[PDB]
Design a protein around this ligand. Structure first.
Ligand SMILES: Nc1ncnc2c1ncn2[C@@H]1O[C@H](COP(=O)(O)O)[C@@H](O)[C@H]1OP(=O)(O)O
Length: 124
């Protein structure tokens, strides 16, 4: 019975590397976090900041979500992240990804009580 909050941590939190993602980081992470079990999740971002810092974004700059909902929040500070994008030759169940490190502001959707991140919307 994985909560939405728990799912966000599994899909998007990676506080352990401080940001040193190898060219194979996404290939390994997308697999270890069970994001290529049913299919190849096209794109996914991992955040290498502390959990408290990412949770704090829910009290930061309120912005519109891409889907039009109003519960998205942009971090005031830039954060260490890694973007994973499926390559053009990626073939299930052998999903392949391009790993790209960056330092950008994250935009997350928040829900619940406590009010915590439940979806990763974008980086800017
Ligand atoms: N039930 C939902 N309500 C709102 N946003 C969603 C929901 N499920 C997924 N998302 C988010 O919508 C976008 C597209 O998702 P998908 O690829 O699964 O269709 C992603 O940012 C995803 O965030 P996340 O993957 O963090 O949940």
């Amino acid at each position: 019975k994985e909560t939405a909050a728990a799912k966000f941590e599994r899909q998007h939190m990676d506080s352990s590397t401080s940001a040193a993602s190898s060219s194979n980081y996404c290939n390994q992470m997308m697999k270890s976090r069970n994001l290529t079990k049913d299919r190849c999740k096209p794109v996914n971002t991992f955040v290498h900041e502390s959990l408290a810092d990412v949770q704090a974004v829910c009290s930061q700059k309120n912005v519109a979500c891409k889907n039009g909902q109003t519960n998205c929040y942009q971090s005031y500070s830039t954060m260490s992240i890694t973007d994973c994008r499926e390559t053009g030759s990626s073939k299930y169940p052998n999903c392949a990804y391009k790993t790209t490190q960056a330092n950008k502001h994250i935009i997350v959707a928040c829900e619940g009580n406590p009010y915590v991140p439940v979806h990763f919307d974008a980086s800017v």
